[model samples]
Target: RHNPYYFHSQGLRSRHESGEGEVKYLERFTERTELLRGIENYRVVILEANPNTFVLPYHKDAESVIVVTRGRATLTFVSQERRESFNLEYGDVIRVPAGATEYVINQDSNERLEMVKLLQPVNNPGQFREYYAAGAQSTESYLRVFSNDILVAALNTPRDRLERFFDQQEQREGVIIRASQEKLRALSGPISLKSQRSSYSNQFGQFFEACPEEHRQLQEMDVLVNYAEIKRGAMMVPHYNSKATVVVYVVEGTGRFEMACPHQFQKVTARLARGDIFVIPAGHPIAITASQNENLRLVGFGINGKNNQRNFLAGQNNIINQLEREAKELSFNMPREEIEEIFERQVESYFVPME
Candidate 1:
């Protein structure tokens, strides 16, 4: 059977900086930073965050769509102008416009924040820069850029005031935030990352995280056969797809998966070894951790045309933030400085660069 791509089967060949024969599929968690690549039209980036991980504020030129797989995570989109926070959960889709600042966090101690990003109409000609105007360069700067005192005041104020402010800003500065779905799609222009930047690694079971072009082409169908391998103690974290369903076929090792909780669902605990297929229903949150200290390998076949239904964690529930807030709330019981230190340290220690 032929794949969805027209390039399937024939004398037709492909060319890119990365080696090519047939468009091979690969797997990567969010931990791999080298997986980040830019394209002329769009880009696809993946992030693997460890338990209780907190990501600093960041933004890119293209619109972003996130998918969470594995551990629970939360995304906080604070409007720099508004100074307000919008929370998102797993299996939730957030269409962020280019240049919109945002932050993310992982809430579970036994989980990881697995995420995938899609950028539209790649800006091959644009210069890339990391923004850091806030005193804290990482997530704080992100919040500052997205949330400003004036904007926040208006947004937090009465609805009439907000509308009046919007009208004034549009007429005075000719600035507008497009809210229509059609406008959002229009802003999400079509663009694919070049496949040449993809890197191949066998440590995680023949995985490649840099091929944006190949991903787009291969993921055109209901299933995308890709590979992944993780060592023991490594968590896959809990996540949910924003746009599609995922079928995980374990090829090696033993592991356990925990789906989202507080909701009654049968057979939530899954134990798997070799040749076991686990179905992660679309829009449901799920996570994975290696049962043993051995290696775990699996294939993720996702169902989505554009692979937009990606993973998202639920850190937006204010779990991590609440921890900090509660630490302050119990200042007398828990030393404020010590609690803050622990809170800050917790965010860093939970997520780290994979070796």
Candidate 2:
């Protein structure tokens, strides 16, 4: 991890015929089961789904986060205990935990579903276990399968007659298998249903929202920031903080980034048209904004170190008026004279800043 480079530029090897840069998996299941390898740490898998494509009955060792980058689809997860479903759209993100039985189906004929998936712990040593629902059958017979020779061998194992096993289980009064709605509800908390930014402009000169400000402890995950933006000319004031790592991704437009590190300081600016991702290491102070007026936007994802607060040294006043009312209501301990001084410092009355 010393290199500290982006994942796409490091682990990716293949390119999609359609010019997609991410890892592509086009799997379809029709009344059959798929035994997939568990991804241990993290994975970014992109799927191009159509109306006929349905991935079913698969499990992984690590938790899975799915983002619908484009199009619409329906994802269903079914197990001996529960069956859950989701109708996903653009910009929506979903989480499927480890050892969960799940599948995805494309319901739209005119659109193709594209998703970006992240699985944790890069190398996972977990096996895929599949259970057939009474009447289900495999599409491919013993000798015709080619893609997975190991899975084929496993399927062919007939340890004992199905009837005998069932009789023995029935006689023993096996464990009861029942679905719990409460458990499933507890596993899934809330869906990040819509885009946070409703509108964008280039007047600010280039803005970015690669990450959203969120509480990490609530998700029981690392503090990660993910946001989206539009238009350009929004400058990021340069300052270094004591908290987590900061990674920047350019979703659109052209921009410039002036970066400074302990050993070196340089400006790595480029015409980030779209789908361009860049990063600045922790403790490195950097300033970024659009170099052109053409629509520019970026979203930044960062580690929310011990302290989850971000500080800005510049432009703090351009968006201070909206916060004054809220600040007054809090009954802040500042003396009246001191409060007047604070307001005088943040005199410009436009925009808003969240505390």
Candidate 3:
């Protein structure tokens, strides 16, 4: 209905109830902007938990793709079929199914455990709900809302047994509670390597593009995650997605992005620093350039990523290079030799030296 520029993201909410003061907290990325044509269905959340703490078990309606941005932690997912536990380190990406019970334990002795999640709304678009299984009266468990007769009828046991299990947490802390170091040692067990993945990386930085090949579980979720880190002075190729709209979040450092919107014959470019969030609509040619001073780290959540194709306009393997010989003259309406010279000037692929 309109050009893709003016929709700056707003109203990002902080989950203070989930954290114990500053020890742990969660930030839910806003999904209320019309600027995001289809990216609103795709959301992102950032969590920070101190070491030696554990998060309570809960199931969410949205499908989750988790990336450990900092420190190491043990994550476990439990479902009807089997239980899978993974030891997560920095830059590791994994998928958590919707409605699956999960918990995370930060076993690191010093570093704080940080994680970024790309969530796709399943039950409702731009909405999701969390149903806490444990922490009865404290966290308002859904099970605790039932009438006494319903509970008594469901289970033969009376009030005595129910209170023992539900009211155990006498202290009112956060969902992320501090656990004893000795207890975590036993809980956070050995790592499991089932579906191995290749996280994209090189001298410049790392890019973890989450797909079925990367995690195998992404097929069901029908989503993709790009946990990218562009080092100092490097530039990402001008790229566009075939069917996905990238909702990008700046994790740290500084950078700038230029996305041209031909509808209004305008360029939608914005200066990016720490905490800046934006979106790149499908088919909009966009390029991200990092500042010379520091690296530009980003988490791009691509929604409806099923068979998503990435085509960069300026690079060695750029889409321009794949054009037929006659297209050089027909598309550019210039002499063949001159257009070829312009195309061959840049020989780098993916990322290259910044101007």
Predicted structure with the largest lDDT when compared to the true one: 3
| TM-score quality measure for candidate 1 | 0.32
Of the two candidates 1 and 3, the one with more favorable lDDT, higher being better, is 3
**lDDT for each residue of candidate 1 in 88-183, tens digit (9 for 90 to 100):** 443332345557676555555554445554444335432233343332211223333444566567557545664454344333210111133343
The positional error of residue 329 in candidate 1, measured at the CA in angstroms, is 12
TM-score of each: 0.32, 0.53, 0.86
Cα displacement (Å) at residue 2, model 3: 14
* Candidate 3, superposed: residue stretches over 4 Å from native: 1-11, 21-32, 136-138, 189-206
Worst 10 residues of 1 by lDDT: 17-26
What is the Cα-based TM-score of model 2?
0.53
Sort every candidate by TM-score, greatest first: 3, 2, 1
Q: Could you tell me the C-alpha RMSD of candidate 2 in Å? A: 13.1
Candidate 2: Cα lDDT at 185:
37
Which segments of candidate 2 are over 4 A away from where they belong?
A: 1-11, 15-43, 50-52, 122-190, 193-218, 233-242, 246-256, 268-273, 290-294, 297-307, 317-355
Residue 57, candidate 3: alpha-carbon lDDT: 89
TM-score of 3: 0.86
